[PDB]
Enzyme design. Structure first.
Site, PDB file in Angstrom:
ATOM      1  N   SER A  66       0.861  -1.122  -0.112  1.00 49.45           N
ATOM      2  CA  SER A  66       0.077  -0.302  -0.306  1.00 49.45           C
ATOM      3  C   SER A  66       0.904   1.551  -0.033  1.00 49.45           C
ATOM      4  O   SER A  66       2.021   1.713   0.924  1.00 49.45           O
ATOM      5  CB  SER A  66      -0.466   0.169   1.302  1.00 49.45           C
TER       6      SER A  66
ATOM      7  N   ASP B 206      -0.005   4.241   0.737  1.00 48.71           N
ATOM      8  CA  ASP B 206      -0.839   5.199   1.064  1.00 48.71           C
ATOM      9  C   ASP B 206      -0.490   4.920   2.747  1.00 48.71           C
ATOM     10  O   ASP B 206      -0.579   5.426   3.397  1.00 48.71           O
ATOM     11  CB  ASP B 206      -2.377   5.449   0.939  1.00 48.71           C
TER      12      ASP B 206
ATOM     13  N   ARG C  97      -6.614   8.594   0.654  1.00 54.25           N
ATOM     14  CA  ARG C  97      -8.069   8.622   0.654  1.00 54.25           C
ATOM     15  C   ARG C  97      -8.430   8.955   2.010  1.00 54.25           C
ATOM     16  O   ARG C  97      -8.887   9.986   1.725  1.00 54.25           O
ATOM     17  CB  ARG C  97      -8.130   7.036   0.169  1.00 54.25           C
TER      18      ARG C  97
END
Ligand code: ADP
Ligand code: ADP
Ligand code: ADP
Length: 748
Positions: free
Chosen positions: A156, A158, A202
């Site tokens: 990931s 993020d 996000r």
């Protein structure tokens, strides 16, 4: 042993979006899997291929995963498979696994991909009962029952997933965002340019925040801590104040998910409008997007993948029909295995936490370093310093030893936090030669303006010690009124630190407190798992290693012997050796007999003969006085006379003004703050008679990362923890890796 995963086979799989490092993770799983004597099946295109079948599940071969470490994104490919979100889909994939005998599932994905696998091994049982209405023979099932364990490596960029300190790719992601701002910044010269970078995010301000701490962002926007009422003006007054204070530019990072107190999103573009409809300056906006996701993976990510990889495969064999789901994770710099659900059922909980305007709560579930970076960031980007003068304690900061990427990052912090406290801060030119020769001066809040990114050592550092000149320094520490020391440097910092204590016995002046922030390319300082500027080096080794190697590929079938730096500390060598997948990295902390060297060369050869075409042999510039590079070279050469060509270059000491990598900049920032903070204390408690007198060994420390938290350790206490002839700490966490490094090399 290699008798662990025999009569056992596993299916690995990427899912979610490309995260630089997934390949290295896969590779690890493949190899360590084949090594455990098990069988590893690939399974292309994420959860899809699993749902699909046949053509989408080739068997993995050892050679199959070479040339991957360095390749960005995923080679096993990822998809988004909506089919898997529903039972039918599973009935379908689960069918495909039992049909091939696969009972172990490695899932390298994220918050989602993870919860998918999660909620699979979950209700897998009846899935079998269902597959029996017709599906398959109950015989190929009887002995493939309740044993479908699954593990999950978190990829990931993020870096949001809860439970791990780092997800795969985010360092790399950070690198990208940095390179841009790096540029966006070194040439904006031409009007009060005001950039507005919009980074991934996000429901997670990590890259957002961190990118702001390294760049020296003028303002940020993060999901977890909305600006609440007012601000436009705040930001204006701000950007406006800084205007007069003089400034070529402004950088306002914006997380994608940037919202306001009410949840009604703050738009990067809107920010731009504002900054112009009000103070109006050429204000541009960039929206990095899906690039952050590419580029080649950083040393850390290559390394993190390999580590998680093995942890996964092991967790996979040691698995059981009575064990819950595993989610290997990095933590306190050691691999752990955390319960899958616990993780997800939490990582989720942070979103809700945010949904309800409960950001204080959101900020809580994130907690960790996060909250710090936050507070520390605001502080350092801060408006400006309050009412000085008065009985403010005065501190001096200096560099000592070989230069490092992060020293300026550190000094800048140390000074700023210093002034935020209301204390005076002097700055010393040229380490100890400094208080001695008396080249000291007061540092105002700007003195360190945008140093954070600058490599090398602005202040000047020399590795010369202090004892031989206590007279001089004590004289100056008395004249300049220095009454606290913050030393950023490497082994000589520690060493000169010990040399200070002794002085406490002969000189009253020396009886002030001091912290030692480790800054050394080599990572040879007792007291911490990492020094500052190590990544930056380690990240350059990796690079040119990849170059040298994946170059001159014309000669074909050729081997390179590379000599890395680090004195007797084989950290760089070992780490790079693992990041650029070298066949062997000869280091000092692990002695090798020629009976080895041979077993090792009579090994690359058997490889250069068949499968492999390029060979990598790393040697610590000191791993051994006789088995010199030139020894190793010729030995590797002659022996491979027929079979291959071979060249050998010596990287040697580089990274002159090498710009510190995002991580070192941060590491060096978090610390110089953590120290000027701790020091505020010791100077406080060491004042007694309108004089300041530390003569305890609680003052005078070395601040280091110790498997999980920073800790101020007392120099004197570390002494018997440190080898002084070789100048290396006595316990080195990373020696624990060597084995995994030799595994991925197909040894033992
Ligand atoms: N709740 C879920 N149940 C089953 N599969 C899921 C679930 N959430 C995500 N997935 C699967 O994960 C993959 C990508 O989902 P995404 O939500 O993009 O996860 P990630 O954030 O880890 O990349 C797809 O195969 C999707 O079907
Ligand atoms: N470049 C790197 N080199 C080594 N370790 C790293 C690197 N980047 C991240 N890590 C690991 O991730 C851990 C957790 O990071 P964290 O506490 O969230 O601080 P940051 O917010 O700086 O990651 C670090 O302490 C370290 O163990
Ligand atoms: N660099 C920054 N980026 C984003 N927000 C900031 C920044 N600096 C300050 N702020 C925000 O300004 C608001 C007020 O600042 P603060 O330090 O709490 O003093 P005060 O509340 O008196 O204005 C806070 O919400 C803080 O998060």
């Amino acid at each position: 042993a290699r008798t662990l995963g025999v009569g056992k086979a596993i299916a690995v799989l990427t899912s979610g979006g490309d995260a630089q490092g997934m390949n290295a993770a896969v590779r690890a799983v493949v190899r360590v899997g084949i090594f455990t004597g098990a069988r590893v099946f690939f399974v292309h295109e994420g959860y899809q291929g699993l749902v699909d079948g046949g053509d989408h599940i080739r068997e993995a071969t050892w050679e199959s995963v070479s040339m991957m470490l360095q390749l960005g994104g995923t080679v096993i490919g990822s998809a988004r498979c909506k089919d898997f979100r529903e039972r039918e889909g599973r009935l379908r994939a689960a069918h495909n696994l039992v049909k091939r005998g696969i009972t172990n599932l490695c899932v390298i994905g994220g918050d989602g991909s993870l919860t998918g696998a999660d909620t699979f091994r979950s209700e897998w049982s009846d899935l079998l009962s269902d597959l029996q209405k017709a599906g398959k023979i109950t015989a190929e099932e009887a002995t493939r029952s309740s044993y479908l364990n699954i593990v999950g490596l978190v990829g990931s960029i993020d870096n949001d997933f809860c439970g791990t300190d780092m997800t795969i790719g985010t360092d790399s992601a950070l690198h990208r965002i940095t390179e841009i701002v790096d540029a966006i910044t070194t040439t904006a010269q031409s009007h009060q340019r005001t950039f507005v970078l919009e980074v991934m995010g996000r429901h997670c301000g990590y890259l957002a925040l961190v990118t702001s701490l390294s760049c020296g962002a003028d303002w940020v926007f993060i999901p977890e801590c909305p600006p609440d009422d007012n601000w436009e003006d705040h930001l204006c007054r701000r950007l406006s104040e800084t205007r007069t204070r003089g400034s070529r530019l402004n950088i306002i990072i914006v997380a994608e998910g940037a919202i306001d107190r009410n949840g009604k999103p703050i738009t990067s573009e809107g920010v731009k409008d504002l900054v112009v409809r009000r103070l109006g300056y050429d204000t541009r906006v960039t929206v990095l997007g899906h690039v952050q996701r590419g580029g080649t993976p950083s040393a850390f990510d290559r390394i993190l993948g390999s580590r998680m990889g093995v942890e996964a495969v092991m967790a996979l064999l040691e698995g059981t029909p009575d064990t819950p789901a595993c989610v290997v994770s990095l933590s306190g710099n050691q691999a752990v295995r955390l319960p899958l659900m616990e993780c997800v059922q939490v990582t989720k909980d942070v979103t809700k936490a945010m949904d309800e305007k409960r950001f204080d709560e959101a900020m809580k579930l994130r907690g960790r370093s996060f909250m710090n970076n936050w507070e520390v960031y605001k502080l350092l980007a801060h408006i400006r310093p309050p009412a000085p003068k008065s009985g403010s304690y005065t501190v001096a900061v200096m560099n000592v030893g070989a230069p490092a990427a992060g020293m300026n990052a550190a000094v800048r912090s140390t000074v700023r936090i210093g002034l935020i406290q209301g204390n005076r801060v002097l700055v010393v030119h040229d380490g100890f030669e400094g208080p001695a020769k008396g080249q000291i001066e007061e540092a105002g809040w700007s003195y360190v303006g945008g140093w954070t990114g600058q490599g090398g050592s602005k202040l000047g550092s020399k590795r010369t010690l202090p004892k031989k000149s206590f007279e001089q320094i004590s004289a100056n520490i008395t004249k300049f009124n220095i009454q606290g020391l913050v030393i950023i440097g490497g082994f000589e910092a520690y060493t000169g630190g010990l040399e200070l204590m002794e002085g406490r016995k002969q000189f009253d002046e020396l009886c002030i407190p001091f912290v030692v922030i480790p800054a050394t390319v080599s990572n040879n300082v007792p007291g911490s798992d990492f020094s500052v500027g190590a990544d930056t080096a380690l990240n350059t080794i990796c690079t040119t290693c990849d170059r040298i190697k994946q170059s001159a590929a014309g000669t074909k079938r050729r081997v390179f012997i590379i000599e890395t730096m680090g004195g007797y500390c084989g950290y760089l060598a070992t780490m790079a050796g693992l990041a650029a997948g070298a066949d062997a990295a000869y280091i000092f902390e692990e002695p090798f007999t020629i009976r080895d060297l041979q077993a090792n060369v009579e090994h690359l050869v058997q490889k250069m003969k068949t499968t492999v075409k390029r060979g990598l042999v790393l040697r610590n510039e000191k791993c051994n006085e006789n088995y010199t590079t030139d020894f190793i070279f010729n030995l590797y050469s002659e022996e491979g006379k027929g079979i291959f060509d071979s060249r050998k270059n010596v990287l040697g000491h580089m990274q002159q003004g090498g710009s510190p990598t995002p991580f070192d900049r941060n590491f060096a920032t978090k610390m110089g703050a953590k120290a000027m903070n701790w020091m505020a204390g010791k100077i406080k408690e060491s004042y007694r008679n309108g004089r300041i007198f530390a003569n305890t060994p609680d003052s005078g420390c070395v601040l280091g990362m110790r498997k999980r938290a920073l800790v101020f350790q007392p120099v004197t206490e570390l002494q018997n923890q440190t080898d002084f002839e070789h100048r290396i700490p006595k316990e080195q966490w990373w020696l624990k890796l060597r084995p995994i490094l030799k595994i991925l090399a197909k040894y033992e």
